[PDB]
């Protein structure tokens, strides 16, 4: 323990306490949303894709949003699989914590195993360091991992939950537990800690990478100050992380407002899609009704398409479902919602999300 | 008894302290933007009812013996405050409305403001003038410099995290100074209500009542025990006084913020208060239907009950409204307007509201 892993204790006059209470406001926020949960579910799928892209690109991945979206909608390369690996790792974190299970040391192992060989067929490093910090000896690593896992799972006061997310993030990289994939794994572990401590009481997307994708140079420069183990360096790291998380939830919480989502994302997405000839005006009219009402039936469009014969309206619904633009709410249901996550409307949504300032590149 | 000097300053506890817990606990509620369906004009009537309770509570602490039933009977019926005791509660209630009308968030609390709080407190019973003359209060020659120091402390642009601690610190130092001859207890409660308004507890909420006397009125020996612990001036005794005040304020905010829910307020307070007047044969059938609409809608105009009273012409509706305005059950929104609200603070409905408030646990006695 060049430095013992312990909780911090700033004075009330410190800016660290300022950021801690700030981020505790957004955790206890009792404001629910008016967005349909079936539309938010597709928004969460899109932002899982954005995080997987961002995390891999931090490690020098060359794939872009166009190439990844193209490989997902319709239609293999090695740089693509590294990214789908992270996407499977986020669904796993979601399902695992939703099933009621906890962040155990083996769960962190399964987290690392998927990040490197997603959905295929874990152990710590048996070698050593390849800055001004020396990763500990490979025989010390299991002890550090056990010391860290027990640290995050201690029943400390919920006021310490967000300081824990910061301390665990640096301590993980300070240990360097695995051979490769530490950067991708520590970001997935931060995501699970964010979900565990209560940021998803189902109307907010969490983008931890967007905090570190912002500056990158400050990210690693703050890690160096924390490597010392001195109180000043660790406090400066927790301030960088917690304020970065605060600024991120500031942005994503706008998508919780139904007016902001419809007017600045969903409705422009169709206008983009219609401008590009992806949908005609009859398909735009039907899809506009879907975002308004949440869902739609064929028997609902008798008045929104009054010049169309009833058989023509039924043909239009079948065309939309086969293309995935409309998707059924339940297996075998004839009640449909918009298809934003797996259809060509995803490009229009990414376009609106890009212009509204949610997507770097 | 002896006067020991003690420096007025902000505390600085560590993150692991219980005081930081209460400080952040209160900061959740100072910044909770509770969206309400309650009409602001309707809430204005409930505002003065809670002014009634604090004024009676602040007066009863300092020896006033009039009961809640006696005070209600002086407002609804009769007219004014003939007894000097009655005037003691009426002075506070008037000063309560003054702070509401003349002090807003962020605005500065001047030394003349605190002096006017004292002048209204003892008006008709030296007013707005300092002492000319356990813990001994400082000599009267030092009171002016101590009050100028306290006002600059309350008005200093210190970080908004310090606002809630400033409420507790200023409350203790004021009584520790004892700047006036009489009415110091009545005044410091008015100053605490002023500080809560200045530090922005009425901004983001259309309807939130704050009863600071209710913190120090549930107990009393504890209120004085925690003050005597703080008169020492030690850092321990001050943090414990702040801890007692902050938790007590947040605990009262928890009880009172339910009244911002229109369904809870209507079902548990306002609609029962209606049937209480109906049960005593104060209102009749049509009058109850009218007042039911005003409660659900917030206000009412004669054209707003064409389908509530279909057999009546608009001129007959107006006669029915005038009967309710004569008895104070309906009140014009402002002078000379033909829009009305339920008179919960002037009519028989005040009695029903107090009963419902007692049943739901807002009034001790």
Automatic annotation (TrEMBL), chain A:
Domain of life: Bacteria
Keyword Nucleotide-binding found: yes
Ranges of residues in domain Fido: 103-243
Active-site residues per Swiss-Prot or TrEMBL entry: 176
Binding site for ATP: 219-220
Pfam families, A to Z: Fic
GO MF terms, alphabetically ordered: ATP binding
Site features described as Important for autoinhibition of adenylyltransferase activity, chain residue numbers: 59
PROSITE patterns: FIDO (PS51459)
Signal peptide span: none
The entry's keywords: ATP-binding, Nucleotide-binding
UniProt name for this protein: Fido domain-containing protein
Lineage of the species this protein comes from: Bacteria, Pseudomonadati, Pseudomonadota, Gammaproteobacteria, Enterobacterales
